[PDB]
Design a protein around this nucleic acid. Structure first.
Ligand SMILES: Nc1nc2c(ncn2[C@@H]2O[C@H](COP(=O)(O)OP(=O)(O)OP(=O)(O)O)[C@@H](O)[C@H]2O)c(=O)[nH]1
Ligand code: SF4
Ligand SMILES: [Zn+2]
Ligand SMILES: [Zn+2]
Ligand SMILES: [Zn+2]
Lengths: 512, 97, 158, 495, 86, 39
RNA sequence: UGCUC
DNA sequence: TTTAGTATATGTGCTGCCGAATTGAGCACGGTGTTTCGTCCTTTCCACAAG
DNA sequence: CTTGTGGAAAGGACGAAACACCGTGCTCAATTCGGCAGCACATATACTAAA
């Protein structure tokens, strides 16, 4: 996981700093270790190690566990450091599904990690008071309403609460409070009657103390999976099937967990009455849609029962496998052309096949299909079976069958995406560093204006800003800006493929 | 070289080294097997621990941590051969004090 | 036909242009049929049945086109449609039909329909790192470094 | 004006940290890329080709042609390495056993180590103790390997992990789809039935459907090692700073300098004497070129894998030229000297060039009895005494004696042969020039290579040594005869 | 037989396939702008601990004028173990 | 060890190299320091 | 290989 | 519900196919070096017809 | 007895291929000796079944 460690290091250096990213990388590479050994191996002061551990555990990146002799060991969560990159997508999806209030709520939750409901609503009000003007003030009523609406939808979840010290072993305080998680009050918001108005940054006891909240990344992952499946089925059959499957997934979200081979089956009557009235669709049309989706060779849904009229169930693992196959074939097509993608789909549909059979079923002349096969072999897109006639395994007396392993190929593609994002971040940082002189020059020549904007602001300071030699460098500045924008866009868009591959690799394991 | 016809010198075999060790003559053994036989001065980089040339480390593209070191030529040949075998000996130098 | 001759081989030379034209024409026909089926919007089942195209139908269509002089059998068009399926552009389904205008397979008929891809191009391919042929030799400090990369340079300049 | 930089420091090596280099580090260390399989040019000068083998940018091996990287002669050239890129990765014969061990240690699906959280913590606590020795490291490796081989299912991803063993030569087989006598699992059934098209097009696949386990070629092994979490690397008893799991599979070959590959230009014929390593590297480059040609021309998979296995075998021979699992049809015709053969053996580097090596300022002569000399004295002939010289430093005590010795010259027995000045290290031969002017200009600190005179301590030894008394330091006395004489009472020690 | 090559292959071999252009739309641009805003605002956040500067040359009267002032968040010591108190 | 000392060309720890020698030079440890007037 | 010891 | 039988399950315990070692050197010499199997280019010499 | 324009052959580079014409093909092990990996295989422990 060297690429993963590099990506985590880059993210922690770009987001938190240097003295903390070293501790994070050390925790990720060595795993759980006490504090003293971490400080000894890192080579820095103890106070810096304490600050790094505290600022990391604040964002739920690392956890602390008790062991024999009451020693505390800190273990980092590389998965969380990788999900950290998905913050822009989280903000975008919570702004699309909800109003800007929930957008700011999730933004504050992600930038602070753990906070109380009162603090987050106060910050949201203070930030939204700047959006509007004309003396209009922001009240906490609507903010708390939006917060509870996000809560009941499992988007925000209460952090693990420390058990009561008086009731649980009253006496000597342990080295660690041993925070535990309770599913009863996991999504129960506290009753806070106090209200207030946000301040406009003029620059001129807590009821919910101890109850910290955070962003439930599992709910965001489930929502992204649902959106991906909906987009896929929309591109395949029609938007009507997309709406049907969206309604089915919305109904199944509550009655199912985040990891299950099959969801709870639904009947035709409930799906019909729960579908929006905006579609002039009858019962027989819904039955036809369901029975034609069940016959789809991709197996997005399944009958799995006949009681209660039309009983159907959604296949999540099969849908994720189909999406992973789509991603793999698309990247193969974009990397080696349409003919190599044809050969890939041929060797994928046929579990085992040889060179002559591939040439016969693909109609690709010789000297070209074998070249693409060997190119894909050199890139770990497929593995050879090599069924031997004799235990000697001599090449001259054995058959070689081509076979694509979806799991290993998906893992390799995920590693490639991680290293690609790492290289993109490295290139962005290099472009920012090499041009930091022009950046500081622009910052200074623009702060000349930013200063004394209104007080003592004479007009004689507007015709001398562009008089400097920065005018011909504005072209290089714009080039750097557009390059950084495109690099960030590519990094964000590769995150979708990373999420698809991670979900496929996660939903195929048992963790037994 | 080996032979007299080839103008070769005598060989202090393993048994001669054993006798010199038994006597405890460390400086005599060093002068025989290091100074008078295959003495050489190499350049080692204190950062990566690899062998440099003319006070320059091509690996790190720097010359501030490169330092001279006395060594038997056979030992340098062994280090080079091991580096060829992917067995990289990284030398961490330090002051003689 | 296997040891010599063939509808694709012409004088011991594979006709790549011929198979390409066949694939393009078949895909255009299937896409037009699917578009007509979608625009009819009479009923989902009827829409899917109309978007479907039997091997005999597309074979007679190709024969009516008359692109090449060599006679193309039904199994030839079937192999062309199978190659198209391998391209990820069409979908085939085997339905049960005793006898009809095709009468090729006993009690089975293959119907082909143009289908859109599952998902658009992924995000990995949109970055030069995902389509790099020397991606294995990438390293922070060395001759091939992301800072002095030519692929990303040309990609940002474009 | 002038910057302060230290000229020389008395650096002493503390310890040698062994490790491995990744392909990127191999590229960084190397100076040029060797891609030409030929050695010399077509012209009659037979100069070495550029960017090819025997290029002078990777050192020099001739006294006339200097190095191209550093402008120095052969005596001062240390040599430079080169890197050769391979089309397909190959298993490192040295680390092949380590590769098998790691593959048995980690999972073949998620690349995680086959250990529970409790066992992971236990091993981390047992390894974090200071003063960990090599024996303890190997014992911990053995214990962890045993406990990992005890398990059969992965606790992280849930994928099945069968036995991983060695088949043939430089080939690894993972028995993922093993035969289950009890109720078979869905995975093995799916794998067996996925051969429908293969059986339809090739019936011979159905009888041989069994024994069709996973074959871990270098590509898959490297892809798996590149995705191993760094947290589990310490559990493999491999130092993270020394190397990485991906370094065991070699993709670049480090061609050594020419100092290790001496070339003799035999002008008496139309050929040159080269070592075996040069021929092995030439064959490896030729095989890489042939593999690239077959890939471009679209060859069959059988011959492609044959060429890949041949390249693996040639690389293994280049590393270790003495293997046992070499097929008979693939067996080498002649015998070549690999690095292992050059290291081990009686004439190896450790026993032949490090433990016991030849020295100068020494002689070998027959012995004869002479009881007229003391037991601590040995007779040296005048002929040998004039050849073995001793460097005496000119001081305030023996200034006149060295003056007289220089005045005598290399002809008269009491004298010297060379003078090394204190300021300049340019030696001066006493046979030429006015020796009197040199004697009159002997400054303090100069070195004079004086002849072996009476009173000089001299080691006297018999080559077959049983005890330490077989070699003794005596006082040399010059005599006109041609044999080494000593008191016969000292014959019993020398035997 | 394969031909001999005089010069080594190019360090960056050319490819006839180019990367697919990035997706366009208001969503992607908004996500880009939000990521840039996060980059700009998370460095000034107290959680972003900077390298403590050291080795001050001299003390001056302008120190109080150039003294960097920034509010520091107070970690909840109830949840955090005792080993991290200053 | 001794073998590594012989290979690396350094005096072995055994024998005469177990101890170190010091020079009996006329000196004065911790010489008087010049006082600082400005500080 | 032959030897010398 | 409980004692007896069947199966598995790993451990452990006895072989058999591997890989590694076998004194120190000194001195002479004779051999041979990678090549060689077939194809093509060049140069030379000589079967007759001409003085 | 000298000569020549055209022809054949012989020798020396030279490139495709892999040092054996064809595809075969043997023998001996040089003597321990400390690993081992297979198999096997045994015994007991645990769980299911009959009373
Ligand atoms: N005349 C002679 N014969 C030798 C020499 N070395 C070996 N032989 C003969 O060759 C056989 C042994 O060969 P080796 O000594 O192993 O040859 P080698 O050492 O592999 O050859 P190189 O590696 O080239 O030194 C013996 O039967 C000897 O008769 C030598 O130096 N001179
Ligand atoms: S050369 Fe640059 S663009 Fe290409 S893979 Fe390497 S870092 Fe990415
Ligand atoms: Zn260096
Ligand atoms: Zn050099
Ligand atoms: Zn696993």
């Amino acid at each position: 996981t060297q690429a993963e460690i590099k990506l985590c290091s880059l993210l922690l250096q770009e987001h938190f700093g240097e003295i903390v990213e070293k501790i994070g990388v050390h925790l990720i590479r060595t795993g759980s270790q006490p504090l003293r050994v971490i400080a000894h191996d890192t080579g820095t002061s103890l106070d810096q190690v304490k600050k790094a551990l505290c600022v990391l555990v604040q964002h739920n990146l690392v956890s602390y566990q008790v062991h024999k002799r009451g020693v505390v060991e800190y273990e980092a969560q590389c998965s969380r450091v990788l999900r950290m990159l998905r913050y822009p997508r989280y903000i975008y999806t919570t702004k699309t599904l909800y109003s800007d209030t929930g957008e700011l709520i999730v933004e504050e939750l992600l930038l602070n990690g753990k906070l109380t409901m009162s603090a987050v609503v106060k910050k949201v009000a203070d930030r939204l008071t700047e959006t509007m003007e004309d003396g209009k003030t922001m009240d906490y009523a609507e903010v708390s309403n939006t917060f509870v609406r996000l809560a009941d939808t499992h988007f925000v979840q209460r952090c693990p609460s420390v058990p009561t010290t008086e009731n649980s072993d009253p006496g000597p305080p342990p080295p660690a409070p041993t925070l535990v998680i309770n599913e009863k009050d996991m999504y129960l918001v506290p009753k806070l009657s106090l209200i207030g108005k946000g301040k406009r940054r003029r620059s001129s006891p807590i009821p919910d103390d101890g109850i910290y909240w955070q962003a439930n990344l599992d709910r965001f992952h489930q929502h992204f999976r649902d959106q991906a499946i909906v987009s896929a089925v929309a591109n395949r059959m029609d938007q009507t099937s997309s709406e049907i499957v969206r309604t089915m997934l919305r109904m199944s979200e509550i009655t199912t967990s985040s990891s299950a081979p099959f969801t709870q089956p639904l009947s035709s009557n409930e799906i019909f009455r729960s579908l929006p009235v905006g579609y002039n669709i009858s019962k027989q049309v819904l039955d036809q849609y369901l029975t034609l989706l069940a016959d789809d060779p991709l197996e997005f849904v399944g009958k799995s029962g006949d009681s209660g009229g039309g009983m159907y169930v959604i296949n999540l693992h099969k849908a994720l496998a189909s999406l992973a196959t789509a991603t793999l074939e698309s990247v193969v097509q974009e990397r080696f052309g349409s003919r190599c993608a044809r050969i890939f789909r041929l060797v994928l549909q046929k579990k085992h096949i040889e060179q002559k059979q591939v040439e016969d079923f693909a109609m690709i002349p010789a000297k070209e299909a074998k070249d693409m096969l060997y190119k894909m072999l050199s890139e770990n897109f497929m593995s050879l079976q090599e069924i031997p006639k004799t235990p000697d395994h001599a090449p001259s007396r054995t058959f070689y069958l081509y076979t694509v392993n979806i799991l290993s190929a998906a893992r390799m593609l995920l590693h490639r995406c991680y290293k690609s994002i790492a290289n993109l971040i490295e290139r962005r940082q290099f472009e920012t560093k090499e041009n930091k002189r022009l950046l500081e020059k622009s910052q200074r020549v623009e702060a000349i204006i930013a200063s004394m904007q209104a007080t003592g602001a004479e007009e004689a300071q507007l015709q001398e800003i562009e008089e400097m030699i920065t005018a011909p460098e504005r072209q290089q500045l714009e080039t750097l800006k557009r390059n950084v924008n495109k690099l960030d866009a590519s990094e964000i868009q590769v995150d979708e493929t990373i999420f698809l591959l991670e979900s496929y690799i996660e939903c195929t394991m048992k963790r037994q | 070289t080996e032979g007299r016809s080839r103008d070769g010198g005598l060989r202090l075999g393993e048994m001669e080294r054993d006798c010199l060790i038994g006597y405890g003559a460390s400086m005599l053994l060093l002068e025989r097997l290091m100074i008078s036989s295959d003495a050489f001065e190499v350049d080692v980089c204190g950062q990566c621990g690899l062998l440099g040339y003319s006070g320059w480390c091509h690996y790190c593209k720097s010359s501030c941590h490169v330092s001279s070191l006395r060594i038997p030529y056979a030992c340098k040949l062994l280090f080079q051969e091991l580096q060829s075998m992917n067995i990289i000996p990284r030398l961490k130098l330090s002051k003689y004090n | 036909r296997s040891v010599t001759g063939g509808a694709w081989y012409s004088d011991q030379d594979f006709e790549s242009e011929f198979v390409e034209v066949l694939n393009q024409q078949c895909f255009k026909f299937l896409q037009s049929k699917a578009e007509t089926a979608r625009e009819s919007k009479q009923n989902p089942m009827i829409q899917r049945n109309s978007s479907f195209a039997s091997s005999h139908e597309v074979w007679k269509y190709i024969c009516e086109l008359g692109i090449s002089k060599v006679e193309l059998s039904m199994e030839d068009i079937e192999t062309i449609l199978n190659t198209l399926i391998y391209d990820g552009k069409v979908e085939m389904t085997i339905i049960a039909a005793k006898e009809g205008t095709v009468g090729s397979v006993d009690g089975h008929m293959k119907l082909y329909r143009a289908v859109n891809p599952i998902i658009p191009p992924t995000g990995l391919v949109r970055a030069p790192c995902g389509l790099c042929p020397v991606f294995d030799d990438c390293h922070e400090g060395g001759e091939i470094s992301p800072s002095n990369c030519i692929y990303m340079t040309e990609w940002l300049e474009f | 004006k002038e910057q302060f930089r230290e000229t020389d420091v008395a650096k002493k090596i503390s310890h040698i940290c062994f490790g491995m280099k990744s392909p990127e580090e191999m590229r960084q260390q190397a100076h040029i890329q060797v891609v030409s399989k030929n050695l010399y040019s077509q012209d009659n000068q037979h100069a070495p080709l550029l960017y090819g083998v025997l290029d002078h940018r990777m050192g020099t091996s001739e006294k006339d042609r200097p190095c191209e990287t550093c402008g120095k002669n052969l005596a001062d050239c240390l040599g430079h390495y080169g890197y050769i890129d391979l089309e397909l990765p190959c298993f490192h014969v040295g680390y092949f056993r380590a590769v098998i061990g790691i593959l048995q240690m980690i999972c073949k699906t998620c690349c995680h180590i086959m250990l529970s959280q409790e066992e992971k913590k236990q091993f981390l606590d047992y390894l974090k103790r200071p003063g960990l020795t090599y024996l303890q490291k190997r014992g911990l490796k053995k214990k962890i390997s045993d406990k990992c081989r005890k398990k059969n299912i992965c606790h992280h991803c849930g994928a099945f992990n069968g036995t991983v063993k060695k088949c043939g030569l430089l080939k690894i087989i993972h028995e993922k789809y093993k035969t289950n006598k009890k109720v078979v699992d869905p995975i093995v059934s799916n794998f067996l039935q996925s051969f429908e098209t293969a059986i339809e097009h090739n019936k011979e696949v159905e009888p041989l459907l069994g024994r069709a386990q996973e074959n871990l070629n270098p590509l898959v092994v490297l892809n798996l090692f590149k995705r191993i979490p760094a947290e589990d690397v310490p559990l493999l008893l491999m130092n993270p700073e020394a190397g990485k799991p991906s370094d065991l599979i070699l993709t670049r070959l480090l061609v050594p300098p020419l100092c290790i590959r001496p070339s003799v230009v035999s002008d008496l014929k139309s050929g040159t004497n080269e070592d075996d390593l040069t021929m092995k590297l030439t064959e490896i480059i030729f095989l890489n070129d042939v593999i690239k040609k077959h890939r471009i021309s679209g060859a069959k998979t059988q011959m492609i894998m044959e060429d890949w296995d041949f390249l693996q075998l040639q690389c293994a021979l280049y590393i270790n030229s003495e293997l046992s699992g070499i097929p008979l049809n693939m067996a080498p015709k002649k015998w070549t000297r690999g690095f292992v053969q050059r290291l081990k053996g009686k004439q190896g580097r450790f026993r032949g060039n490090l433990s016991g090596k030849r020295v100068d300022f020494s002689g070998r002569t027959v012995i004869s009895p002479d009881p007229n000399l003391r037991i601590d004295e040995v007779a040296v002939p005048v002929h040998v005494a004039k050849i073995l010289t001793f460097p005496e430093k000119v001081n305030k005590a023996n200034i006149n004696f060295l003056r007289k010795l220089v005045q005598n010259g290399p002809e008269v027995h009491p004298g010297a042969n060379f003078i090394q000045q204190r300021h300049t290290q340019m030696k001066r031969f006493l046979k030429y020039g006015n020796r009197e002017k040199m004697a009159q200009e002997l400054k303090y600190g100069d070195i004079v290579e004086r002849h072996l005179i009476d009173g000089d301590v001299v080691l006297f030894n018999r080559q077959p040594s049983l005890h330490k008394l077989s070699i003794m330091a005596h006082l040399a006395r010059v005599k006109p005869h041609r044999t080494f004489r000593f008191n016969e009472c000292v014959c019993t020690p020398y035997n | 037989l394969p031909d001999v090559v005089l010069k080594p292959p190019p360090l960056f071999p050319d490819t006839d396939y180019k990367p697919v252009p990035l997706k366009t739309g208001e969503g992607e641009e908004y996500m880009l702008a939000l990521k840039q805003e996060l980059r700009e605002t998370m460095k000034r956040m107290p959680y972003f601990i900077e390298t403590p500067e050291e080795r001050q040359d001299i003390e001056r009267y302008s120190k109080r004028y150039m003294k960097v002032y920034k509010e520091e968040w107070i970690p909840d010591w109830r949840r955090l173990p005792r080993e991290m108190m200053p | 060890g001794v073998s590594e000392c012989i290979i690396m060309g350094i005096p072995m720890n055994i024998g005469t190299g177990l101890f170190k020698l010091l020079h009996k030079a006329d000196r004065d440890p911790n010489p008087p320091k010049r006082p600082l007037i400005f500080d």
